[PDB]
Amino acid sequence: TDNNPEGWTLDKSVNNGTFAGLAENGVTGLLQSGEPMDFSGANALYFW
Amino acid sequence: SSDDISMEIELNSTKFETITGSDVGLRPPLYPTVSRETLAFPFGKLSI
């Protein structure tokens, strides 16, 4: 609803939010905009 | 130990409860069961 980047409503509206294969009340994983550093990306060889 | 620890800042009138199930997929195991081994729970850049 806002221009805040991290917010993407936790288990969102009317649809139950279950594939039939997730089997949890927890889906979210939304936050922490900073992911860890990638050793499979474009800069992988230099890091390795 | 999914969603086991959770920070909840109180503001002057409101509050915002985050949780490491909503943050960290990295999960410090209780094994190294051999005594006195301490653990860590990093929160990456919690923008409140």
Task: Please tell me the distance from the alpha carbon of residue B43 to that of residue B22, in angstroms, as a whole number.
Answer: 10
What phi and psi, each to the nearest 5 degrees, are found at residue A35? -80, 160
What phi and psi, each to the nearest 5 degrees, are found at residue A47? -65, -45
Does A2 touch chain B if contact means CB atoms closer than 8 Å? no
Specify the resolution in Å: 3.3
| The residue type at B19 | I
Task: Please tell me the distance from the alpha carbon of residue B15 to that of residue A7, in angstroms, as a whole number.
Answer: 16
Task: Tell me A36's DSSP state.
Answer: P
| The residue type at A43 | N
Task: Please tell me the distance from the alpha carbon of residue B2 to that of residue B19, in angstroms, as a whole number.
Answer: 10
| The residue type at B22 | S
Classified as helix, coil or strand, B8 is strand
Residue A45 distance to chain B (closest CA, Å):
24
Classified as helix, coil or strand, B9 is strand
